[PDB]
Amino acid sequence: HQKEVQYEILQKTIPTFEPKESILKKLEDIKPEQVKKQTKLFRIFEPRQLPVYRANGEKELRNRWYWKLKRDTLPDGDYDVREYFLNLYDQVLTEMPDYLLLKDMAVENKNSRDAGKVVDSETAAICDAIFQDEETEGVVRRFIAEMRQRVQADRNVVNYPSILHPIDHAFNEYFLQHQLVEPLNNDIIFNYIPERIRNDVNYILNMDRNLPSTARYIRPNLLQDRLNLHDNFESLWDTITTSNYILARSVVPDLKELVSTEAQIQKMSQDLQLEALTIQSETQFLTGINSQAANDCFKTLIAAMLSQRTMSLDFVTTNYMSLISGMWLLTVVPNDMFIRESLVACQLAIINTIIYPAFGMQRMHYRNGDPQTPFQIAEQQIQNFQVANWLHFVNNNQFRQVVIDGVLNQVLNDNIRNGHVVNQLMEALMQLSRQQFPTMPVDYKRSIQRGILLLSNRLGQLVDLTRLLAYNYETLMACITMNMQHVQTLTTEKLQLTSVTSLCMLIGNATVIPSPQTLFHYYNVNVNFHSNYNERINDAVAIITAANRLNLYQKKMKSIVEDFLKRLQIFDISRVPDDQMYRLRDRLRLLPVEIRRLDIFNLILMNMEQIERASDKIAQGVIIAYRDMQLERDEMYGYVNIARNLDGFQQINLEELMRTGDYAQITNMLLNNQPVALVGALPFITDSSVISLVAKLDATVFAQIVKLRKVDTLKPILYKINSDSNDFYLVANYDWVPTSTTKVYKQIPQQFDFRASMHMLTSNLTFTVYSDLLAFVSADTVEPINAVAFDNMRIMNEL
Amino acid sequence: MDVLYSLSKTLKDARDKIVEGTLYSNVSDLIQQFNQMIITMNGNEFQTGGIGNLPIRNWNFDFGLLGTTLLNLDANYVETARNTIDYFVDFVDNVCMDEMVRESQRNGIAPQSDSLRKLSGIKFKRINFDNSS
């Protein structure tokens, strides 16, 4: 009960999904980055006809074209406007196309006299409206009627006329000029295959497909970890190695043609003579010896090495057959793949039950925390060359590090790869079978020596097994794309030494290597995970940097980090400790923004002011000038109390006033009628009544600021006086200058200009994007009887 | 030598470019290089100067990274950068002086001072960047 409680306390801090096996599905459902195609030109603005007024305020007989926001949804308050533009940034990033083919958006120009086409249908509508307009210049009309697309199929190029606002043109031009599709040919596919698989003669790779020159693909982003999750993220790294271990388990091949369990079990029982002993556990000695355990051991060892997930050793000390098998396990598997306590426990059991008793040595009084393992002490304390040399190998058989194709790999000593070191193990244990065991009761000594010989007499099978294990490890490691970082993980995979015994006593001579399709699937899942990891890092970094550069100081980067972890697909975010979440935020802040996202953000940041000032529902401020200022004469309003700028007034930032809560300066200025300019995104009332201006109602709207100590209900009056006002005759039939004491800081819409809006958009005529590159490869394998290792000899040679 | 030059060049860039009001895009690559330099030098002890009247100076590096989140640099950013830069400039000047006053008949091209010998280690090669002089 207690042990489960403490282990649950630990496991609640690890974001691994509790049914480990189900993680496989979550890893296999990660797809390549979704390819986005543009169906229409990106537009924030549209042309619109608006009424205009003469200087006297009379509505003219013609409308004028102006650029307006297609969706005018801007909020009030500067902070909320910046939030709006962060949301716009996210929208652009999510809808950003990976490639464009303008011909899909090419429609007919109704007024074309030369079979002309334009992109897109919105351009067609605008061009028709301009063509019909009576105020259009004859040269513009003739050009609309004559402007031509150019399709060059030989060059795979298209050019179309488009009408776009300059900001919309910038977005679409960036999309056209920075597409993610590269030319795809057989050389790129062939190089996509891992190099160590292209060089293994056990696999036959062919290219039986012709790619057209129009073939395209999107390169995966296989950048190595910029967050260094193997450093100081214990829970996250534990989850990463667990998920990798599950995947590697899925791809390790199943063993074939094992030794009959009945025969080997009877052989082991006859040799060990356990019934004739006095062991308190007679039945348990040979339990856990079967084909299922041997296959599980094979999978566990290869997958644990592939994922660099730490292993613990679970064994019964009295089971010396398990310890004899553990001798082989420590011979072939690097000692650093095990948790220190388990390695020390197994070595100390081997020393104090088998090896030191064999040589008559005093049992090792080992001390926990010793920089030397029990085997490192034994190597110095043992004089026999067979045992000392095998011990020396075990003491130094740690993973070697090597970078291949930019991927860090944990590789084995060559004596493991060719299986020669098993001979040394054999030598050592043959010596142990000849030893006297001075004080040992003879029946127990005979049993120990016969179990030693049970492992010893499988020398050929063990060499074959070591070579098979190493070859499978190397072939599967060729498919790894992220650096194999070695860290001692919080939790381990528990490996039974009885399963090691099953593998050692039951392996035959049937070679099993990964299937080419298994290798391609493993590599594809690794690539998809790596690419998704990089893309989610880039998305998180882009949003964090945008929020900071947009001065979104109430934004919680924790939600961003949680979304990033959730999109990585392998983390239960509820079990991520807070310190690691904050460390993740800190490391994400330090990374630079990816070029495409940063360019989109720069476009948005540079055009923010223009977009915000185009909105019809927010003004940029209000000047309270307690002097009488003449209403401006604007073509868009008639008479309007509009301020072009804020020159000549002290500015109170409304966002700062809202945040501080300190209304002393604003209250003092309003009480004393001190001229001021309140700056910030404000909703305004459009008042068309001359009587309202004569009543001076625009000066009546600020006192609620002092009453409530709020600024989120401030709605200044923007007068709009023209011939459409019901009381306009007062302006027309009397001698007086319409004035007000307040002005609204707002901008005037930009006029549509055909010359500044007409662009030629260029793209490719047509191509096909492909995603599954390895689907273009025909992949066969040799007969497993003929499979060879790195040394060109057969993986298994006992035949 | 390449590492000492890279330190000096990074510091000169930081002095010339980390200025109040400047767009962060003007400094982003430099900020990355500077943070790399800080990370590499953190936790390292150096001793310069025990020859002639050159005084013994001990150097310890425990500095925070510069921020990346601003749009334009402000006074706070510049002050933190300036304190770190001042310490690093003092260290580089002392290392250069320590190397300039030493000579060897056998391997006079190789580094002579202990600090430059330490900086020749692989754990500092990350500092290395544009060698344009």
UniProtKB/Swiss-Prot annotation, chain B:
Intermediate capsid protein that self assembles to form an icosahedral capsid with a T=13 symmetry, which consists of 230 trimers of VP6, with channels at each of its five-fold vertices. This capsid constitutes the middle concentric layer of the viral mature particle. The innermost VP2 capsid and the intermediate VP6 capsid remain intact following cell entry to protect the dsRNA from degradation and to prevent unfavorable antiviral responses in the host cell during all the replication cycle of the virus. The VP6 trimer contains a zinc ion located at the center of the molecule. The zinc ion is not essential for either trimerization or transcription activity of the DLP. Zinc-depleted VP6 has an increased sensitivity to proteases. Homotrimer. Interacts with the inner capsid protein VP2. Interacts with the outer capsid glycoprotein VP7. Interacts with the outer capsid protein VP5*. Coiled coil: none annotated. It comes from the Viruses. Residues 62-73 are annotated as: Interaction with the inner capsid protein VP2. The chain holds residues 1 to 133 of 397 of the full protein. It is found in: Virion. This is Intermediate capsid protein VP6. The N-terminus is blocked. Belongs to the rotavirus VP6 family.
